[PDB]
Ligand binder design. Sequence first.
Ligand SMILES: Nc1nc2c(ncn2[C@@H]2O[C@H](COP(=O)(O)OP(=O)(O)OP(=O)(O)O)[C@@H](O)[C@H]2O)c(=O)[nH]1
Ligand SMILES: [Mg+2]
Ligand SMILES: [Mg+2]
Ligand SMILES: [Mg+2]
Ligand SMILES: [Mg+2]
Ligand SMILES: [Mg+2]
Ligand SMILES: [Mg+2]
Ligand SMILES: [Mg+2]
Ligand SMILES: [Zn+2]
Ligand SMILES: [Zn+2]
Lengths: 335, 157, 118, 205, 23, 37, 157, 80, 43, 140
Amino acid sequence: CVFLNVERMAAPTKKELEAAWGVEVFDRFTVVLHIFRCNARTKEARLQVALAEMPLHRSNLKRDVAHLYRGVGSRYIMGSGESFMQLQQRLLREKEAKIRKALDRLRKKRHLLRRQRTRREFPVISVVGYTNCGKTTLIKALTGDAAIQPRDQLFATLDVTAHAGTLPSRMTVLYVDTIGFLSQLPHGLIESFSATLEDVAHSDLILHVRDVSHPEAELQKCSVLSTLRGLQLPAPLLDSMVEVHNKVDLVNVVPVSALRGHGLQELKAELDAAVLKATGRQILTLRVRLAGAQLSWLYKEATVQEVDVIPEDGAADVRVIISNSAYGKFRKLFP
Amino acid sequence: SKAVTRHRRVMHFQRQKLMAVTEYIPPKPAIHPSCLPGLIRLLRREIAAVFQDNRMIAVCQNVALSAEDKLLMRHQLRKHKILMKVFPNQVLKPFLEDSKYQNLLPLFVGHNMLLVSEEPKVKEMVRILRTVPFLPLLGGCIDDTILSRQGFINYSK
Amino acid sequence: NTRHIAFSGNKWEQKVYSSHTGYPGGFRQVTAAQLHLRDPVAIVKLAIYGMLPKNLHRRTMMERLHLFPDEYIPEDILKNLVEELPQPRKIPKRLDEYTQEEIDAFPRLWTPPEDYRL
Amino acid sequence: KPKLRFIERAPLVPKVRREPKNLSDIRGPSTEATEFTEGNFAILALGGGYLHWGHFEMMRLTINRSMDPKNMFAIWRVPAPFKPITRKSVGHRMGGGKGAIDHYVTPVKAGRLVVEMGGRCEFEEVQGFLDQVAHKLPFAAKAVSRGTLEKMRKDQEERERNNQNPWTFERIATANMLGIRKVLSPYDLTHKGKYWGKFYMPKRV
Amino acid sequence: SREYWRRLRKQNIWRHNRLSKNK
Amino acid sequence: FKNKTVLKKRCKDCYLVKRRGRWYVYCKTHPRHKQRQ
Amino acid sequence: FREVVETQEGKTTIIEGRITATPKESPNPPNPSGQCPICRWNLKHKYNYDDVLLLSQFIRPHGGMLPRKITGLCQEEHRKIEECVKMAHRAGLLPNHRPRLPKSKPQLNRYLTRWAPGSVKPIYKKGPRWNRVRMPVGSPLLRDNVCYSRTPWKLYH
Amino acid sequence: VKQVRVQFCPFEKNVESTRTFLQTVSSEKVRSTNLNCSVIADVREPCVDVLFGDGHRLIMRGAHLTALEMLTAFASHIRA
Amino acid sequence: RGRIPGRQWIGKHRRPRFVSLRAKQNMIRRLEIEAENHYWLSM
Amino acid sequence: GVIRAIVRAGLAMPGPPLGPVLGQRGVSINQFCKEFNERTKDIKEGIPLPTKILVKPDRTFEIKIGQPTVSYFLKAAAGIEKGARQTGKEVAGLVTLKHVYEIARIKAQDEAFALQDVPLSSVVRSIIGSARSLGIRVVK
RNA sequence: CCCAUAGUAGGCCUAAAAGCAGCCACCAAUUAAGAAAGCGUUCAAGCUCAACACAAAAAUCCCAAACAUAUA
RNA sequence: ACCUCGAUGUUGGAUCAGGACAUCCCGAUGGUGCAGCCGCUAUUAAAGGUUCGUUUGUUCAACGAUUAAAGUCCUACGUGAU
Ligand SMILES: Nc1nc2c(ncn2[C@@H]2O[C@H](COP(=O)(O)OP(=O)(O)OP(=O)(O)O)[C@@H](O)[C@H]2O)c(=O)[nH]1
Ligand SMILES: [Mg+2]
Ligand SMILES: [Mg+2]
Ligand SMILES: [Mg+2]
Ligand SMILES: [Mg+2]
Ligand SMILES: [Mg+2]
Ligand SMILES: [Mg+2]
Ligand SMILES: [Mg+2]
Ligand SMILES: [Zn+2]
Ligand SMILES: [Zn+2]
């Protein structure tokens, strides 16, 4: 076969190249679609890659049905007026409609799942970036999980998944690993994953993992920013987007090395600052009587950074990072 | 239909009859048979040695105490030469007849803890028991002479 | 006494009598208990009707049939009566109906523990 | 290498000649891999069926995840899929020649062991996930140890010896009584009525 | 011997733990 | 209540009771463990 | 049989227990060595739901069955007696063993009722002749009861 | 509950019910439930006298009562 | 309701057939006759 | 409630291992460390010391302390700072039975630790087992 | 069903990892307790356990009526 | 390729609708990541109801405005001797 490194070749171009070169012709769209189909394992991923495929099926409809024509039509005087190609196109449209309905249901279910994490006010950091730039490795380094398996191949992660981690402020932050983005690729392919990628929209912060070591890091930045704008992420979130330069070992921001684990502590510090300024969490000192379970309530509903106890007054001043909702609850519960 | 089918193929009625007639018949057993007719010895020696060596014996129901409370009671008992022993009733029952203790049969039921000694600090032990108004002193038998609670009180006094 | 018939098993609740008025949505399925509470003669009438031969004489036979829910019978029918057929099922006796002689005759099969609350 | 080995989708040298679906390789009792070898527990096939690479992946992943590599070892007792199964294009009318090779399977006959486990462990530790695998297998299957396998074989022998039925499928088929060979198959003379297609009736005597 | 049965109990607890690892 | 062909006790407080002709897994500490056959 | 009597006097409620007269097994069982009452008195397969004279001997005064550990019945006969008791109660043959304590319910005469009347759904769609939904009658636990008829019992109607 | 007194004579039989009642009521969980609630296990037919916080007495003569029945009555009177 | 697809007794989905005690007894009787035939042919 | 810690007598304010863990119940860290330092002055300095603090519901401290740990004590006796990795074949120090007896003399005397058995064997066996689990060989 | 003290928070490991993140050993005290089989803990703590003690659903309207006990 | 080619008239729409429930709404109930409002899921319920328009023959589909909802189907792709 021949892989023509073009975003997408038109039908006449594909036909002419096939006839001339006597072999199958693949473009960036087809190759990326093939790898997506191969790597997809979850039902959600399979559905999303099916939606992504739909344009390919429409393009290859004529070739995929050429073996079913049987020369029947326009002379059989009874039956629905639909011709062979009309029926095939109708079937393809019905399949696409089924896929879109299923994806809408999936989006509803994802919102249902997000309900709880939103209610409990877990800060959410969506790790986005170019394909193979180290998002999964960085999330593994931050969270400490071992089940995370950063592969070497492209588009390894096809599922939007949330992993919890701890910041230096003892605050628990939920990192959302997402699908990587690629340049010179049809926007529809990635946008077919919007059902699962809407978790990025509801994120409190976004972390762009720049593969600085890569020669075309600037082009990768342009591609990922354009892809995010196409995905229609909130403008405030895209503005607040933080950047981390991964793979710094190979060679205003925080340079980090996920595998070696070099700038992780710094990155965690800036992430802490970002989540404080984004989630509306106030780091404040609060004086509480050492009785009535106020201290335990503060522990369970907020991150108690430290406790300085005054036994003379039998009280304690707690430096705590408390959200507005938690602060209101505390003020009402313990006047 | 092929010989091997993904489903259980329907058998020809004669084959079905053959399979039904050649079914396994279990042997009926006429009348149902259902309604026709180291550590232990180590503690045996332990109990024999305890009974022989100890001069005075008593028993109680030290089960209603916490771990720490039982430990403290054990400490106070070890302050004297008295030793507290725990042994199963299942194997203590034969020991009464083995050692010829007929009057001791209706004393060891349920939880039972022996209080074996030779020098009676029963006065101070009863004093300790008094501040905890439970865990009653239970009948014992000193030197082959059964003593009731009043007997222990008189002996203490 | 057709009101006092007895079904074996859970037929009172499981047995369903089906009919259809003919009009759309006119399918009526009524349990045996409901049909009995509605009409105290329907159960026996339907049983006899289903057991009679399915020919043109069946309705004449049913006309000859007479059913009465309770002990009361019309005087003319009573005067017509000739013979009383034996009841197909012998009614088992209740403990209250068992005589002391029979209770004494039946042996006690086990010695209950004396110290049992029962 | 205690953990269960990976199984390839198709033989490295693909088969070129399409071959007939000889269902006799599923039909009847199994004559190979019927006894334990370097192990104490296994999954016994109480029926006939074809194992796909999907079934192989299920077995491998489940057993590998649920086993203890430092105290348990597992080994395949079934070869990698080799028998080619051909599927025609969807919407194809009958005729036009045999279809192109689509997948590879491995025939399994009733009475065969599919996976065998051993090591410093007892049955109870492994029977759980072996039964999970067996229930998810395409054919009836059961997690069986050496002791339990011998127990069931001896129970079958005891039932055969002490059956009170004067008439046995073996006797009637062999003697052609009632002319039942007109309704039976030549294979039935050896199956003795305990096998019907791919299904193995174990209670059948 | 007390220690004999202590070791036996330890081994039985180990066997129970191994069996219950999956349960 | 979720209809389940196989009924499993999901915690210590689940109890099996046959009511109205079918089995039920009832639970008070975790009502979400409630199951019907 | 012991009975617990509680008396409220003043504000000091007392409660004691008195052992009343207890029945004794009739002398000379026909088949000694029987491991349980039924197989001892030669009644393994010769009693039915309507044999109240037999069932009541294993009945709590309010109708509940008595435990195996007390009755002495083997497991199979205990199950048979329990099912026969349920059938007798549903048939109305035990009018003096009613639940302790009522609005008027319709009086539907029954007998040989396997299931509770309030738990069986109507058979609205009886299946085809080869898959008919049949109505159970009697209990399968009594399938081995001595059959004096040439045809076996029909447990399903 | 205010006070619970248990009296029995072991050498006389038919004392298992009262002895088990003692071993259960004196259980550290029960006593910790109400430290103020005072137990007195006297010994010398067998009886259990429970004086409640409301000045109400429950007298259980455990000669022919099982420990389960005695405990159930005790709990019912606690509920009041 | 209660349809057998296609024709009864021939297709893949046939009407179920069940052996009665009568049929079992008939087959057993014939088997006994044939066993006696074997005995008398064995000499 | 009882709170258990193995803090070192040297550093009385390490931070995380005491602050957050003790603050949940409600503690006076200043008083706690003052009392712990008083105990450190009473005993040798620079050695781990198990604590048996019980936080009463009345919000008061009753600190109970006893002998040093066993692992660090044995390592110091055998001249070891960091324990062996394998601990089944690795060994860094050897301790004689006489030394084991001598150290045990001042071991079975604590209340909270419950090491109160009259027989010498009961405690010598325990310490020998601890040493065997650690990378220490029992000479003769 | 009852019940649970404790060498010690076994070492290394790691910020700490304390039966429970991983590796090595897995001894040992109390009559009785795995250097811990599942929860839970950032880590602890708290929970247990082991140990003592005593089956299904589709579209006109279900589909003979019924029946468990009289001798093959 | 089993009935029908000495005809079983054809896709949609109008009209009238019959039926199933695998329920879209209205009814009752369990769970919930059910604080409340919105919801999601499941059991039971088919008595009643389930809109009007632009484009397109559209059955469908996109869009506008509504609704408590604008249900999935079968009925000769119900219904051309209407
Ligand atoms: N040398 C080096 N390689 C790194 C570094 N961070 C990540 N990588 C490698 O970059 C590749 C990225 O793998 P993942 O992190 O799984 O990829 P991803 O960012 O999730 O992207 P997708 O594979 O498209 O899902 C792997 O080969 C990593 O080992 C780093 O700091 N240095
Ligand atoms: Mg990834
Ligand atoms: Mg037909
Ligand atoms: Mg236990
Ligand atoms: Mg034809
Ligand atoms: Mg043909
Ligand atoms: Mg004609
Ligand atoms: Mg429904
Ligand atoms: Zn539960
Ligand atoms: Zn019996």
